[PDB]
Symmetry: C4
Subunit: 24 residues, 4 copies
């Protein structure tokens, strides 16, 4: 994938991690 797509995918994963930490 392109660098922009990988950054967008990386941002999505950080959002998922944040949600898990808030609800842990």
């Amino acid at each position: 994938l392109s660098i922009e797509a990988r950054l967008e995918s990386i941002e999505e994963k950080l959002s998922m991690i944040l949600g898990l930490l808030r609800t842990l």
Copy 2:
């Protein structure tokens, strides 16, 4: 979104996650 901007967002979230683990968790 530009690369520098998208990076800034990512960097924002990492500092938020790093701060919670280091101090808030007990």
Copy 3:
């Protein structure tokens, strides 16, 4: 900084995955 941006991206993606995996099993 010898490593290519893509290579650095792959390392970041791997670390994210490991982080998520550990978080989910908690």
Copy 4:
């Protein structure tokens, strides 16, 4: 956004490593 994309990525990589170490200790 003064720093270069390669340096910012490396910094982002570093923070990810710190986050993984903190999560495992919990």
